[PDB]
């Protein structure tokens, strides 16, 4: 099996680089964040613009959905995160504490917590209701590029330009593992596999790696794309064939067979770096987004 992703929609509207796209867990919406300080919401199936959510004072680097699809959190150069009620557009809470740009963010599966990573080299864990910082982890010695909860919220994985992936106990704030292979290029992205067994890590040497968390060993290596400069999102696609999906600095979306490591498709159309990709929770749909000289989001659909 190889997928057959075909371009369905191009979503135009952001006036600067798009930074992150994410599908809502209920599958109904796509959220995009941008350097233009805005979050936009679009229909996942029809690509139709829904609304703009605004409030940050500088550009946004990341956005994430709560499990019930009703809240968003965004991470901004204004050094804050904001929690938003999507239906009302209200900023419920502004999460203050970071001392430099906030780069990445995610809700835990229960969605009572938010994890953030910053250029201040810390990872913070926040309470969603109170907006209070619960924990500040001395996570890394360079900007934190990604943070992600595993499927039961018990672990956080973080990555940094310092070349390390670290795994944290959500409950204690304790570092449970540091992952490093045979070199330490900047790690520009990390995330847990849906089943929580693996971590997918991007490094700025044009390489993606699949790590077995428990064994602390690299199992798979994916290459062929270009990634030396930007923190590009990568994904596990699981709705059809089991793929790895990533953007690339040659303006393509790359799709690999997870087990064989072969490139199975390259999606063409963007005119600048594909900084973000996201996979729909139930259907074979990929969203991709590009930087300043493109400014668009694309939705692609496949039979498998």
């Amino acid at each position: 099996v190889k997928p057959n992703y075909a371009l369905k929609f191009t979503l135009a509207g952001h006036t600067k680089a798009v930074s992150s796209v994410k599908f809502s867990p209920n599958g109904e919406w796509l959220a995009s964040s941008s350097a233009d300080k805005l979050i936009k919401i679009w229909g996942a199936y029809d690509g139709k613009f829904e609304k703009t959510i605004s409030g940050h004072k500088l550009g946004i680097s990341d956005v994430a959905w709560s499990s019930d699809s009703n809240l968003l959190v965004s991470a901004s150069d204004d050094k804050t995160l904001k929690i938003w009620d999507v239906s009302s557009g209200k900023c419920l809470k502004t999460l203050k504490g970071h001392s430099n740009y906030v780069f990445c963010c995610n809700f835990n599966p229960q969605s009572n917590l938010i994890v953030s990573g910053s250029f201040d080299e810390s990872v913070r864990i926040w309470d969603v209701k109170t907006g209070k910082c619960l924990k500040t982890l001395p996570a890394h010695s360079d900007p934190v590029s990604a943070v992600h909860f595993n499927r039961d919220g018990s672990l956080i994985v973080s990555s940094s330009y310092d070349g390390l992936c670290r795994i944290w106990d959500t409950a204690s704030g304790q570092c449970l593992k540091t992952l490093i292979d045979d070199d330490n290029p900047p790690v520009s992205f990390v995330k847990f596999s849906p089943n929580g067994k693996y971590i997918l890590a991007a490094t700025l040497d044009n390489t993606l790696k699949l790590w077995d968390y428990s064994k602390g060993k690299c199992l798979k290596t994916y290459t062929g794309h270009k990634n030396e400069k930007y923190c590009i999102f990568a994904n596990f696609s699981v709705t059809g064939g089991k793929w790895i999906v990533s953007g690339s600095e040659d303006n393509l979306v790359y799709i690999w067979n997870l087990q064989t490591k072969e490139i199975v498709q390259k999606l063409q159309g963007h005119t600048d770096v594909v900084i973000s990709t996201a996979c729909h929770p139930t259907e074979n749909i990929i969203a991709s987004a590009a930087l300043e000289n493109d400014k668009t989001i694309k939705l692609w659909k496949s039979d498998c």
Binding site: S19, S61, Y101
Partner: peptide, 16 residues
């Protein structure tokens, strides 16, 4: 006049 380098977001810039 607009600023020469409109502030965007860290993800859209290259960090050395």
């Amino acid at each position: 006049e607009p600023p020469l380098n409109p502030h965007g977001s860290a993800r859209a810039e290259v960090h050395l």
